[PDB]
């Protein structure tokens, strides 16, 4: 379990790889894969769509059932559900959607959920269709998470920008 390779070490607990999080999950079968979710766990596109498609919609069926019960998540919150064929657990984490003016302060709350798990395979939160500054999201991740997070960034342009920015932060 958790046999990650090819990651660049940024800090003592944050690693980054240019890779598809679904392919990483299939190769490693991590204890926890993080989903970049919305409050209804509607896994339409991006990371959520990729993860759900890999489960042939089992993640969505499970998610629809959770929401039908406990109601939607809060922005900045999370829930632990099955990892299906990708991982033992999936931590669905809701970062703020700044395309909707959701408070960017909730990005720190979002990353704080990672601290409930020893080791996570995760995407960068609130970027892509959530619209947040991805350098900012990396900075909040590095500043906030206390446990071991392995970040999988599919987009090579974004990956190179993130790594170049991290080298210039310190
Ligand atoms: N890069 C990237 C993305 C993304 C989309 C789809 C995937 C995937 N399959 N694996 C990893 N990353 N990934 O992750 C961030 C999620 O907030 C945004 O920048 C997205 O554009």
Curated annotation (Swiss-Prot):
Subunit-level organization: May form homohexamers. Interacts with N protein.
Catalysed transformations (reactions): Thiol-dependent hydrolysis of ester, thioester, amide, peptide and isopeptide bonds formed by the C-terminal Gly of ubiquitin (a 76-residue protein attached to proteins as an intracellular targeting signal)
Annotated consequence of substituting residue 164 to L: In strain: Gamma/P.1
Free-text activity regulation comment from the record: Inhibited in vitro by GRL-0617.
Parent sequence residues shown: 1025 to 1194 of 7096
Role this protein plays: Responsible for the cleavages located at the N-terminus of the replicase polyprotein. Participates together with nsp4 in the assembly of virally-induced cytoplasmic double-membrane vesicles necessary for viral replication. Antagonizes innate immune induction of type I interferon by blocking the phosphorylation, dimerization and subsequent nuclear translocation of host IRF3. Also prevents host NF-kappa-B signaling. In addition, PL-PRO possesses a deubiquitinating/deISGylating activity and processes both 'Lys-48'- and 'Lys-63'-linked polyubiquitin chains from cellular substrates.
Record-annotated Macro domain positions: 1-170
UniProt topology in membrane: Multi-pass membrane protein
Subcellular location: Host endoplasmic reticulum membrane
Protein name: Papain-like protease nsp3
């Amino acid at each position: 379990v958790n046999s990650f390779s090819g990651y660049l070490k940024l800090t003592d607990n944050v690693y980054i790889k240019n890779a598809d999080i679904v392919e990483e999950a299939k190769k490693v079968k991590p204890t926890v894969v993080v989903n970049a979710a919305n409050v209804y766990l509607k896994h339409g596109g991006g990371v959520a769509g990729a993860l759900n498609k890999a489960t042939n919609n089992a993640m969505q069926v499970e998610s629809d059932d959770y929401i039908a019960t406990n109601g939607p998540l809060k922005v900045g919150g999370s829930c632990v559900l099955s990892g299906h064929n990708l991982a033992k657990h999936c931590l669905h984490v809701v970062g703020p959607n700044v395309n909707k003016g959701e408070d960017i302060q909730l990005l720190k709350s979002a990353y704080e959920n990672f601290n409930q798990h020893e080791v996570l395979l995760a995407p960068l939160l609130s970027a892509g269709i959530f619209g947040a500054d991805p350098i900012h999201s990396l900075r909040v991740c590095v500043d906030t998470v206390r446990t071991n997070v392995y970040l999988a960034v599919f987009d090579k342009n974004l990956y190179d920008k993130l790594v170049s920015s991290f080298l210039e932060m310190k």
